[PDB]
Every structure is written in structure tokens, then in C-alpha cells.
Amino acid sequence: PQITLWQRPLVTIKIGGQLKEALLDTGADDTVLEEMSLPGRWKPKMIGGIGGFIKVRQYDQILIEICGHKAIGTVLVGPTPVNIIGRNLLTQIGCTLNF
Amino acid sequence: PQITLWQRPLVTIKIGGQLKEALLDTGADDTVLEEMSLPGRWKPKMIGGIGGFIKVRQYDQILIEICGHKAIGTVLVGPTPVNIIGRNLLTQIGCTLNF
Ligand SMILES: COC(=O)N[C@H](C(=O)N[C@@H](Cc1ccccc1)[C@@H](O)CN(Cc1ccc(-c2ccccn2)cc1)NC(=O)[C@@H](NC(=O)OC)C(C)(C)C)C(C)(C)C
């Protein structure tokens, strides 16, 4: 699909058997989700944004369906104000910027 | 141009007679730049991100040339770790997301 930016580029995703809406974020190296429940193990990690740094849980090889496209990658979970789909996953679903 | 996301989508921009590199950021409602010198008046404003919030100067009707395309909009200036080109400007240069 082609998406214009007059509004937030929100997409529906399916992860850990649950449905959520997430922002397609070209300015995000990583994918960050708000507190939700995920199976398996993780490693502590910290990441930075505007405003400072937040502490997250890191989960590798996680399946995610973004607007019907599957992808497996690292997903971070924590105190983010909004669910974010980062470049690590955008590349897998063939997402591109155009102008 | 079309742009893949294997790398951070950086572009050269011309603003306030100066050259900068900036990130095309679909996850940004606003355009925010590192401390720089701009002419005119502004106002104090606050904006939020992943680690919290930063205070910035707001400038309306600022001319920016992004990868050779011209746009006039609000540009914020302050303590951001990286120059960000937000949707308020992305829409003006006809930038889309595709997959
Ligand atoms: C290498 O660092 C990163 O990749 N930081 C990524 C990040 O923060 N990206 C920012 C741009 C950025 C990159 C590198 C260093 C610092 C900042 C954006 O791509 C995505 N983003 C993600 C984001 C979106 C909403 C919010 C938010 C926060 C508090 C309250 C409401 N919304 C926070 C972060 N947006 C914002 O912070 C924007 N906020 C915004 O549009 O607010 C509506 C700004 C910019 C205009 C301030 C993540 C932490 C998400 C991975």
C-alpha cells in the first residue's frame, strides 16, 4: 500500500497473539512496543529518543504481522508512549520512502 | 527519489542560508533541528518523545529546501540529538511510504 503522511501512518499489527496499532517510523532504528505480554526470554536494554533514555526488554526472533506482511526480528517492550515499528522491521516488509 | 530503509534516511537540507543533514521521520508530527541560528521571532514551546520532553523555539513560515525541494512551514529549534524533518514538511515535498 502507498501511504501519504497527512495523518499518522498507523498500521494494524499482530504480535504475541494480540492485535495492536503501531506507527511506521522511518526515524526509528528499533521497534518499540508498550507494555504487553510476550513469551520467552529477554535481555535488558536502554534506548534513546528525544527527551532521554528509556529502559526496555529486548526480545529477538519475534514474529510480527504488519498490515498482513510477516517479519521476524527484535522487538523492544517498555514505557514508550506509542507503539513504534522501526527500520529493523520496515526493511523486511519492503517499505520505502518516496518523493 | 525512492529511498530504502537499510540505512537512516538522511538528506541534505538548506535552511537559514546554511547546510545540514536531516532525518526523514514519518514518526515525527513536527520538524526539529539542533541549535542553529535563525532570523526572526519565535515562541517557547514544549515537545515530547521517547525519553521525555524538550523545550524548543518555534518558528512559523520558515523556508527549507529538502533534497532540492522547497517547503515553508514551522521549524522548531532546540536540544535534539539529530535534525528531524517531520510530517508537517514531508507532506509538502510529496513524500510517501510504500510497501
Ligand atoms: C537511534 O535512536 C532512535 O532511533 N530513537 C528512536 C526515536 O526516538 N526516534 C524519533 C527520532 C529520534 C531518533 C534518534 C534520536 C532522537 C530522536 C522519531 O522517529 C520517532 N518519534 C517517536 C515518538 C512518537 C510520539 C511520542 C510521544 C511522546 C510523548 C507523548 C506523546 N507522544 C514519542 C516518540 N518521535 C518523536 O520523538 C517526535 N514526537 C512526536 O511526534 O510526538 C507526537 C518528535 C521528534 C517530534 C519529538 C526510538 C527511541 C523510537 C527507537
Short mmCIF file of C-alpha atoms and ligand atoms in Angstrom, two decimals:
data_model
loop_
_atom_site.label_atom_id
_atom_site.label_comp_id
_atom_site.label_asym_id
_atom_site.label_seq_id
_atom_site.Cartn_x
_atom_site.Cartn_y
_atom_site.Cartn_z
CA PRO A 1 0.00 0.00 0.00
CA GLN A 2 1.08 3.58 -0.53
CA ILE A 3 0.64 5.84 2.40
CA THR A 4 0.61 9.58 2.50
CA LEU A 5 1.71 11.49 5.62
CA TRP A 6 -1.18 13.99 6.16
CA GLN A 7 -2.03 11.75 9.12
CA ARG A 8 -0.01 9.45 11.43
CA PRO A 9 0.98 6.34 9.48
CA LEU A 10 -0.71 3.82 11.76
CA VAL A 11 -0.98 0.22 10.89
CA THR A 12 -2.61 -2.77 12.50
CA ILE A 13 -0.16 -5.45 13.66
CA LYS A 14 -0.43 -8.89 15.17
CA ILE A 15 2.13 -9.97 17.78
CA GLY A 16 2.11 -12.48 20.61
CA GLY A 17 -1.45 -13.47 19.52
CA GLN A 18 -2.63 -9.92 20.17
CA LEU A 19 -3.77 -7.09 17.95
CA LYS A 20 -2.31 -3.60 18.14
CA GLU A 21 -1.91 -0.40 16.11
CA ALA A 22 1.64 0.84 15.52
CA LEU A 23 3.36 3.79 13.89
CA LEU A 24 5.51 3.20 10.81
CA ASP A 25 8.56 5.20 11.86
CA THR A 26 11.39 5.82 9.47
CA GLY A 27 13.17 7.78 12.20
CA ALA A 28 13.37 4.76 14.47
CA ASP A 29 16.30 2.32 14.24
CA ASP A 30 14.42 -0.07 16.52
CA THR A 31 10.87 -1.36 17.03
CA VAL A 32 9.37 -0.40 20.38
CA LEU A 33 6.14 -1.59 21.95
CA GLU A 34 4.36 -0.53 25.04
CA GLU A 35 3.90 -2.91 27.93
CA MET A 36 2.33 -6.10 26.70
CA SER A 37 2.87 -9.72 27.40
CA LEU A 38 5.36 -11.75 25.40
CA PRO A 39 6.60 -15.35 25.72
CA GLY A 40 10.23 -16.38 26.03
CA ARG A 41 13.35 -14.79 27.33
CA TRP A 42 14.81 -11.36 27.06
CA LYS A 43 17.84 -9.10 27.84
CA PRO A 44 17.82 -5.58 29.42
CA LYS A 45 18.45 -2.68 27.28
CA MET A 46 18.27 1.07 27.09
CA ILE A 47 17.45 3.21 24.09
CA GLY A 48 17.34 6.92 23.39
CA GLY A 49 14.93 9.39 21.94
CA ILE A 50 14.05 12.98 22.27
CA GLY A 51 13.75 13.53 25.94
CA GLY A 52 16.23 10.99 27.15
CA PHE A 53 16.57 7.28 27.55
CA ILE A 54 14.10 4.53 28.47
CA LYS A 55 14.77 1.05 29.85
CA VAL A 56 13.35 -1.81 27.79
CA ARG A 57 13.13 -5.57 27.48
CA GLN A 58 14.73 -6.97 24.47
CA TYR A 59 13.24 -9.94 22.52
CA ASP A 60 14.89 -11.49 19.43
CA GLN A 61 13.46 -13.62 16.63
CA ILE A 62 9.89 -12.42 17.26
CA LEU A 63 7.18 -12.91 14.69
CA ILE A 64 5.12 -9.93 13.76
CA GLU A 65 2.47 -9.23 11.15
CA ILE A 66 2.44 -5.69 9.87
CA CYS A 67 -0.54 -4.86 7.74
CA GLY A 68 -0.55 -8.53 6.51
CA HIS A 69 3.15 -8.83 5.93
CA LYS A 70 5.11 -11.16 8.12
CA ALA A 71 8.50 -10.36 9.61
CA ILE A 72 10.77 -11.73 12.30
CA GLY A 73 13.08 -9.57 14.29
CA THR A 74 13.97 -7.91 17.53
CA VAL A 75 11.23 -6.25 19.44
CA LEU A 76 11.62 -4.00 22.42
CA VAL A 77 8.99 -3.61 25.10
CA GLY A 78 8.64 -0.84 27.60
CA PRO A 79 7.49 2.65 28.58
CA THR A 80 7.03 4.06 25.12
CA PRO A 81 4.13 6.49 24.65
CA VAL A 82 3.23 4.78 21.39
CA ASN A 83 3.90 1.50 19.61
CA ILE A 84 6.68 2.02 17.06
CA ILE A 85 7.68 -0.09 14.05
CA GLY A 86 11.34 0.67 13.30
CA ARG A 87 13.72 0.19 10.38
CA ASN A 88 14.76 -3.28 11.57
CA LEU A 89 11.25 -4.44 10.66
CA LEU A 90 10.36 -1.90 7.91
CA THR A 91 13.11 -3.24 5.70
CA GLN A 92 11.60 -6.74 5.93
CA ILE A 93 8.24 -5.72 4.64
CA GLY A 94 9.77 -3.79 1.76
CA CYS A 95 8.87 -0.45 2.97
CA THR A 96 10.25 2.58 1.20
CA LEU A 97 10.06 6.37 1.21
CA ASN A 98 9.18 8.16 -1.95
CA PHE A 99 9.13 11.74 -3.30
CA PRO B 1 13.72 9.66 -5.25
CA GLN B 2 12.81 6.40 -3.71
CA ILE B 3 14.62 5.56 -0.51
CA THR B 4 15.19 2.23 1.17
CA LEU B 5 15.49 1.87 4.91
CA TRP B 6 18.56 -0.27 5.38
CA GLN B 7 20.17 2.97 6.45
CA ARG B 8 18.89 6.04 8.23
CA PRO B 9 17.09 8.14 5.59
CA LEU B 10 19.25 11.27 5.75
CA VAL B 11 19.03 14.12 3.37
CA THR B 12 20.79 17.36 2.81
CA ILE B 13 18.68 20.44 3.57
CA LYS B 14 19.19 24.13 3.12
CA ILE B 15 17.80 26.38 5.81
CA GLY B 16 18.62 29.84 7.11
CA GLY B 17 21.38 30.06 4.43
CA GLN B 18 23.09 27.02 5.98
CA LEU B 19 23.62 23.39 5.02
CA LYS B 20 22.53 20.48 7.21
CA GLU B 21 21.76 16.76 7.07
CA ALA B 22 18.39 15.75 8.46
CA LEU B 23 16.41 12.61 9.03
CA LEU B 24 13.15 11.97 7.12
CA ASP B 25 10.96 10.87 10.01
CA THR B 26 7.48 9.57 9.50
CA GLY B 27 7.16 9.13 13.27
CA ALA B 28 7.53 12.86 13.81
CA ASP B 29 4.49 15.22 13.74
CA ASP B 30 6.96 18.11 13.92
CA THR B 31 10.25 19.20 12.32
CA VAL B 32 13.00 19.69 14.86
CA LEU B 33 16.54 20.99 14.40
CA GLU B 34 19.62 21.20 16.52
CA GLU B 35 20.63 24.58 17.85
CA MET B 36 21.17 26.82 14.92
CA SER B 37 20.88 30.46 14.09
CA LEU B 38 17.68 31.64 12.54
CA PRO B 39 16.35 35.09 11.85
CA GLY B 40 13.13 36.46 13.22
CA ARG B 41 10.79 35.93 16.12
CA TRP B 42 9.60 32.74 17.80
CA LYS B 43 7.93 31.40 20.85
CA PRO B 44 8.69 28.94 23.60
CA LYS B 45 7.16 25.56 23.13
CA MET B 46 7.40 22.03 24.51
CA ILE B 47 7.54 18.79 22.65
CA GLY B 48 7.51 15.13 23.58
CA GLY B 49 9.41 12.00 22.56
CA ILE B 50 10.59 8.71 23.87
CA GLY B 51 12.55 9.84 26.90
CA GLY B 52 10.52 12.81 27.90
CA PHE B 53 10.21 16.28 26.74
CA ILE B 54 12.27 19.09 25.46
CA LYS B 55 11.71 22.81 25.22
CA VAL B 56 12.10 24.45 21.88
CA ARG B 57 11.74 27.69 19.92
CA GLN B 58 9.00 27.72 17.42
CA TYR B 59 9.32 29.45 14.03
CA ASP B 60 6.48 29.71 11.54
CA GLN B 61 6.76 30.10 7.81
CA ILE B 62 10.40 29.13 7.61
CA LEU B 63 11.75 28.21 4.20
CA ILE B 64 13.53 24.89 3.87
CA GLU B 65 14.98 23.14 0.94
CA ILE B 66 14.90 19.35 1.38
CA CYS B 67 16.89 17.29 -1.11
CA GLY B 68 16.22 20.09 -3.61
CA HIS B 69 12.53 20.53 -2.93
CA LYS B 70 11.29 23.74 -1.32
CA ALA B 71 8.74 23.94 1.53
CA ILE B 72 7.56 26.60 4.01
CA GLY B 73 6.41 25.53 7.45
CA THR B 74 7.04 25.57 11.14
CA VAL B 75 10.51 24.68 12.26
CA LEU B 76 11.40 24.05 15.83
CA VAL B 77 14.87 24.57 17.24
CA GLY B 78 16.35 23.14 20.38
CA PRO B 79 18.26 20.34 22.13
CA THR B 80 17.50 17.45 19.80
CA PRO B 81 20.20 14.81 19.26
CA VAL B 82 19.62 14.85 15.47
CA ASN B 83 17.95 17.04 12.89
CA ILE B 84 14.43 15.76 12.17
CA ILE B 85 12.16 16.50 9.22
CA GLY B 86 8.60 15.79 10.36
CA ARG B 87 5.29 15.17 8.60
CA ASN B 88 4.40 18.85 8.60
CA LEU B 89 7.15 19.22 5.95
CA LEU B 90 7.19 15.68 4.46
CA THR B 91 3.67 16.19 3.10
CA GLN B 92 4.90 19.32 1.21
CA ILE B 93 7.52 17.57 -0.78
CA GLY B 94 5.12 14.82 -1.72
CA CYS B 95 6.78 12.14 0.36
CA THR B 96 5.04 8.79 0.76
CA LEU B 97 5.57 5.43 2.39
CA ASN B 98 5.29 2.34 0.21
CA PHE B 99 5.17 -1.43 0.57
C1 LIG C 1 18.74 5.90 17.40
O1 LIG C 1 17.72 6.43 18.19
C2 LIG C 1 16.38 6.16 17.81
O2 LIG C 1 16.20 5.51 16.83
N1 LIG C 1 15.30 6.68 18.73
C3 LIG C 1 14.11 6.16 18.09
C4 LIG C 1 13.37 7.67 18.32
O3 LIG C 1 13.22 8.15 19.37
N2 LIG C 1 13.06 8.24 17.19
C5 LIG C 1 12.47 9.53 16.93
C6 LIG C 1 13.59 10.32 16.35
C7 LIG C 1 14.88 10.32 17.12
C8 LIG C 1 15.91 9.50 16.69
C9 LIG C 1 17.13 9.43 17.35
C10 LIG C 1 17.33 10.19 18.47
C11 LIG C 1 16.30 11.03 18.91
C12 LIG C 1 15.09 11.09 18.24
C13 LIG C 1 11.32 9.59 15.97
O4 LIG C 1 11.50 8.86 14.81
C14 LIG C 1 10.11 8.91 16.29
N3 LIG C 1 9.34 9.50 17.35
C15 LIG C 1 8.58 8.56 18.17
C16 LIG C 1 7.58 9.18 19.11
C17 LIG C 1 6.26 9.49 18.80
C18 LIG C 1 5.40 10.04 19.76
C19 LIG C 1 5.90 10.28 21.03
C20 LIG C 1 5.20 10.82 22.09
C21 LIG C 1 5.87 11.03 23.34
C22 LIG C 1 5.25 11.57 24.46
C23 LIG C 1 3.95 11.92 24.36
C24 LIG C 1 3.30 11.73 23.15
N4 LIG C 1 3.89 11.20 22.04
C25 LIG C 1 7.21 9.97 21.30
C26 LIG C 1 8.04 9.43 20.37
N5 LIG C 1 9.09 10.88 17.54
C27 LIG C 1 9.37 11.88 18.32
O5 LIG C 1 10.04 11.89 19.26
C28 LIG C 1 8.60 13.09 17.83
N6 LIG C 1 7.36 13.21 18.60
C29 LIG C 1 6.14 13.32 18.15
O6 LIG C 1 5.83 13.35 17.02
O7 LIG C 1 5.12 13.42 19.13
C30 LIG C 1 3.79 13.34 18.73
C31 LIG C 1 9.36 14.43 17.77
C32 LIG C 1 10.64 14.29 17.01
C33 LIG C 1 8.54 15.44 17.01
C34 LIG C 1 9.64 14.94 19.15
C35 LIG C 1 13.37 5.30 19.02
C36 LIG C 1 13.66 5.54 20.50
C37 LIG C 1 11.88 5.28 18.79
C38 LIG C 1 13.83 3.98 18.59
#
